[PDB]
Design a protein around this nucleic acid. Structure first.
Ligand SMILES: [K+]
Ligand SMILES: [K+]
Ligand SMILES: [K+]
Ligand SMILES: [K+]
Ligand SMILES: [K+]
Ligand SMILES: [K+]
Ligand SMILES: [K+]
Ligand SMILES: [K+]
Ligand SMILES: [K+]
Ligand SMILES: [K+]
Ligand SMILES: [Mg+2]
Ligand SMILES: [Mg+2]
Ligand SMILES: [Mg+2]
Ligand SMILES: [Mg+2]
Ligand SMILES: [Mg+2]
Ligand SMILES: [Mg+2]
Ligand SMILES: [Mg+2]
Ligand SMILES: [Mg+2]
Ligand SMILES: [Mg+2]
Ligand SMILES: [Mg+2]
Ligand SMILES: [Mg+2]
Ligand SMILES: [Zn+2]
Lengths: 131, 51, 191
RNA sequence: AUUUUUGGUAAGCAGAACUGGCGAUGCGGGAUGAACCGGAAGCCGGGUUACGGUGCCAAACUGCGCGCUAACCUAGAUCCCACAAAGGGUGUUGGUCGAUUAAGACAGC
RNA sequence: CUGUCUACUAUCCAGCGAAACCACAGCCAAGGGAACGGGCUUGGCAGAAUCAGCGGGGAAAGAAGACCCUGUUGAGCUUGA
RNA sequence: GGCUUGUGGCAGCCAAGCGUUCAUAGCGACGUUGCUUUUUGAUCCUUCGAUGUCGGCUCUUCCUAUCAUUGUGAAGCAGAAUUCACCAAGUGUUGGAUUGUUCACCCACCAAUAGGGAACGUGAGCUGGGUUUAGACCGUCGUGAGACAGGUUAGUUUUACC
């Protein structure tokens, strides 16, 4: 197909989101967003399907006190689909991945957005329900 | 590439003199550079060949 | 030091008709017409006719001219000689394709007045070059991967060859190793 | 401030010698300026100059002459003065000392 | 990363009605100059009369700098004067 | 701010050497010529009947000695990457932890996270954390009043209608 269309950003830096993967982390604390060139005073922000740098605040000791990549799979901020329907999730969630985009865990606890599944084949394969 | 065609291409790409001051590409028989910014320098070196 | 008189003369073959007026030189021959505007030269152009024989001569001289001014006499004479050669024999330039892996595909458009290069270093871009006035480009049959440029004006033929050559410059690579291109290999006369 | 001159990397820095000047002084010139150039002054008419100028601004020649420069860096354009160096140029213009040459000088056949 | 709403102002009108401040005044670039000009020199320019704001400049106003130094001026305090 | 440029910063010239050989791809010892006023000094010309004294925030513009981006020459340029140099200031040059900080040092992104001026831009534009009044504590010094290029805590930011 083509390329992802822009969607409303609702997770600026310092946002804490649930961890939907099986790694053992409970939440993800976003410290930066990949691909952001930015502007003065503007906080980098991520959306569903974006890759971010995050740390684990609650979880196994092995996962804490370090920086790892993560991909956002759910967001509460509504965004507009090309068909005109605005949609949103119940919570904010993400999954830990390696820089190549491979999931560190093996399963996803809840649903994931279609954009993230289209962008990341491994996450889609590990997902239960898309949208 | 055939030796004849290789030599033909090298005539345009390899056999040159390079000005030390401004790196200008000059004909193999050049004695002074043609560029004004280097004051038509006479400090020339051959273009280095692949070895 | 302002030499009093610098003069040079050239012989004109009987098969060429030449006219000079206000430093405007017209050259006529079997192959066609050529023109040149030498108004930028502060020289005196004179055509001398021998009544007994009938042969023509062109004399160009400079009065109280410096070395810089005097250097143009031979330039003008060589230009007139080139015009005569072009109008009697014509000019033929030969170009050869050089490539290591990707063969260069040449497509001559209608009238032998344009050329297309498509596979230069495996590039998907199409290179377009238009032949100058009076110059035609044909693909040689007896020589593999050879382009033949023919015309009456030496400057136009050479400039067309230069355009073809410069349209296929290698970029972002060591040109000493990547020698691909189209280069002038022979300069001659059609006749 | 010219010249002599000490400390200081230097300074529109700091300190001395002779003389002059500004201060206390206008006036013409240096576009402009306390010190530079000219020159010092009652109120006027005429004539002539000093320094400096005579393409316009702006009074006086696009005056009569010889060479050099062509600036694709904003060529250059007048003591103080409002900066430029070492190195370079096969740009061009003169000079100096050498070498080859009509028993034929240099380049290409 | 701003948007929006309410009241009172600002705004416009009737009536009423000060003060600060003010050498003369008020467009700029450069030059020189007391070494940062609104005025002088050379240029750029430049067209009646008015309204609401604004905080670049007026080296803005507010005070004969309280810092520092000087005076053969004090004063509070201390002591082995 | 002005003169100067020792010091700071930025360039050039010669070529002993380095660079598997090779002075000059890339460097440049011994020497030597410069430029700049975003360093710090030197001086004391202007201001003491007062030109609001750090830093940050906001906002505009300007410079090039170009970090990225456009187009190029060179290489000890196979490719990739990198390095040297040339036109070039059109566009851009970020989010955070500690520190009042300028500066510094890390985390992260990015094409890049270049360097600077504008009265060390900008307080009748803000702020007031620091310096720099009066309260108070500590250490050292002093017999003492008190001192302190030492530390600490609290400490009024005025006016436009010309
Ligand atoms: K960024
Ligand atoms: K009223
Ligand atoms: K002007
Ligand atoms: K006294
Ligand atoms: K008292
Ligand atoms: K210096
Ligand atoms: K001072
Ligand atoms: K003062
Ligand atoms: K800050
Ligand atoms: K308090
Ligand atoms: Mg900020
Ligand atoms: Mg005198
Ligand atoms: Mg008189
Ligand atoms: Mg000045
Ligand atoms: Mg006083
Ligand atoms: Mg007082
Ligand atoms: Mg006394
Ligand atoms: Mg070498
Ligand atoms: Mg530059
Ligand atoms: Mg810029
Ligand atoms: Mg004690
Ligand atoms: Zn050169």
């Amino acid at each position: 197909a083509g390329n992802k269309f822009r969607m409303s950003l609702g997770l600026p830096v310092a946002a804490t989101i649930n961890c939907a993967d099986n790694t053992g982390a409970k939440n993800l604390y976003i410290i930066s967003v990949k691909g952001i060139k930015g502007r003065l005073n503007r906080l980098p922000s991520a959306c569903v399907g974006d890759m971010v740098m995050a740390t684990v605040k609650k979880g196994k000791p092995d996962l804490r006190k370090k920086v790892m990549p993560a991909v956002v799979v759910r967001q509460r901020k509504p965004w507009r689909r090309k068909d005109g329907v605005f949609m949103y999730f119940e919570d904010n969630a993400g999954v830990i991945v390696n820089p190549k985009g491979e999931m560190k865990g093996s399963a996803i606890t809840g649903p994931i957005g279609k954009e993230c599944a289209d962008l990341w084949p491994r996450i889609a394969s590990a997902a239960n329900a898309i949208v | 590439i055939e030796p004849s065609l290789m030599a033909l291409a090298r005539k345009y790409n390899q056999e040159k003199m390079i000005c030390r001051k401004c790196y200008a590409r000059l004909h193999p028989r050049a004695v002074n550079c043609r560029k004004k910014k280097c004051g038509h320098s006479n400090q020339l070196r051959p273009k280095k060949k692949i070895k | 030091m302002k030499t009093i008189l610098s003069s040079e003369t050239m012989d004109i073959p009987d098969g060429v008709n030449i006219k000079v007026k206000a430093k405007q030189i017209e050259v006529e021959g079997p192959r066609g017409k050529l023109t040149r505007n030498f108004k930028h030269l502060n020289l005196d152009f004179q055509l001398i006719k021998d009544e007994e024989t009938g042969k023509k001569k062109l004399k160009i001289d400079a009065w109280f001219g410096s070395r810089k001014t005097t250097a143009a006499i031979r330039t003008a004479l060589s230009h007139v000689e080139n015009l005569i050669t072009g109008v009697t024999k014509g000019y033929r330039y030969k170009m050869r394709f050089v490539y290591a892996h990707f063969p260069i595909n040449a497509s001559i458009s209608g009238g032998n007045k344009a050329i297309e290069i498509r596979n230069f270093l495996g590039e998907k871009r199409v290179r377009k070059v238009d032949m100058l006035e009076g110059v035609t480009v044909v693909r040689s049959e007896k020589v593999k991967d050879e382009l033949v440029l023919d015309g009456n004006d030496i400057e136009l033929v050479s400039r067309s060859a230069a355009l073809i050559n410069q349209k296929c410059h290698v970029k972002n690579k060591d040109i000493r190793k990547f020698l691909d291109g189209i280069y002038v290999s022979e300069k001659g006369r059609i006749v």
